[PDB]
Amino acid sequence: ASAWPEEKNYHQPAILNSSALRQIAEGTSISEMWQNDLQPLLIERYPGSPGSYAARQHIMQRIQRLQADWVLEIDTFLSQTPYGYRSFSNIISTLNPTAKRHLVLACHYDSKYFSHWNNRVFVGATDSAVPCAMMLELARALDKKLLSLKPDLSLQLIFFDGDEAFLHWSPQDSLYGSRHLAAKMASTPHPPGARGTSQLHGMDLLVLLDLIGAPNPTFPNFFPNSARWFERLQAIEHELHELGLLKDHSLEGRYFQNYSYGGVIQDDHIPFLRRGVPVLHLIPSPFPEVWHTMDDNEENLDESTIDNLNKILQVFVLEYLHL
Ligand SMILES: [Zn+2]
Numbered sequence: 306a307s308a309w310p311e312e313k314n315y316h317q318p319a320i321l322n323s324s325a326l327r328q329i330a331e332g333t334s335i336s337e338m339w340q341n342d343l344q345p346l347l348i349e350r351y352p353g354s355p356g357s358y359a360a361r362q363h364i365m366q367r368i369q370r371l372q373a374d375w376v377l378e379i380d381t382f383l384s385q386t387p388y389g390y391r392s393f394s395n396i397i398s399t400l401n402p403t404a405k406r407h408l409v410l411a412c413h414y415d416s417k418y419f420s421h422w423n424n425r426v427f428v429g430a431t432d433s434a435v436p437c438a439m440m441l442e443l444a445r446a447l448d449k450k451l452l453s454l455k456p457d458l459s460l461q462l463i464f465f466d467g468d469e470a471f472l473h474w475s476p477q478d479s480l481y482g483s484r485h486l487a488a489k490m491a492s493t494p495h496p497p498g499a500r501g502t503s504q505l506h507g508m509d510l511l512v513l514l515d516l517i518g519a520p521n522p523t524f525p526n527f528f529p530n531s532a533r534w535f536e537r538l539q540a541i542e543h544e545l546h547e548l549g550l551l552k553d554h555s556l557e558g559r560y561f562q563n564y565s566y567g568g569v570i571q572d573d574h575i576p577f578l579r580r581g582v583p584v585l586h587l588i589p590s591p592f593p594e595v596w597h598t599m600d601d602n603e604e605n606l607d608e609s610t611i612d613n614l615n616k617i618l619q620v621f622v623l624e625y626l627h628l
Pocket of ligand 1: 417432469597
């Protein structure tokens with residue numbers, strides 16, 4: 306009986322030196338992400354809407370154009386909702402599908418439903434169009450390094466549909482795509498042919514990005530079983546800062562601070578966390594001031610903060626994958 310699902314407990318990063326850090330800082334482009342990955346998503350995209358379809362095609366197209374060997378799957382299913390039965394479609398993009406272990410980055414691509422109000426439309430810029438765009442920019446910026454994966458460990462991206470409640474949050478009206486996918490992964494043997502291990506056992510760590518893009522975010526260290534990875538984000542932020550590789554950034558105003566949070570924040574990691582998957586929850590506390598208002602738009606995003614977080618996340622991912 307293999308102990309491979311315990312490998313994630315001892316897994317250590319291969320830390321980048323200064324020269325490599327400067328290279329990663331220079332290899333991501335916030336303006337290219339803005340134009341090519343983010344703006345096409347700043348549209349109404351609640352589940353089942355025309356915008357949902359457009360957002361899903363955009364995400365698939367941007368991944369498909371890359372050199373790395375991404376395998377795209379659309380996980381479509383039905384769920385009861387306050388409005389009756391509806392269909393939802395999660396997007397999963399995976400490098401090395403048969404690799405036993407994957408580091409998983411995720412966010413939700415649906416936007417919360419709101420009837421148009423005084424001609425304004427909710428596009429959920431921080432929630433979570435930016436997180437989607439950060440994942441797409443990370444795939445683009447690290448494409449040459451990721452192509453080399455073509456340590457039985459690789460990378461997977463998940464874009465959840467139906468994170469938002471159709472009304473106000475309730476246990477049955479929220480997290481449609483993640484409750485469905487977590488259950489599906491928990492009941493799918495992995496690697497193919499396995500007798501007793503599932504796709505969830507293969508999830509080394511679920512890094513969930515949510516509500517990112519406002520000024521001065523502070524991310525709490527939520528869980529003890531991922532605290533050492535939260536510490537790595539702190540260290541990466543500190544070193545990128547010291548090397549002069551971040552913009553409009555100070556250590557007093559750092560994003561990863563030393564502080565936990567006792568409470569529970571309901572989000573797409575919950576169905577995974579309750580089935581034993583380690584989670585690194587990159588959601589700020591407090592939430593952006595524009596949360597769930599028509600002001601959660603492009604004008605209120607903080608460009609340099611998103612750029613700095615792209616650098617930090619890309620270094621974290623390369624160090625985890627030893628690339
Ligand atoms: Zn929301």
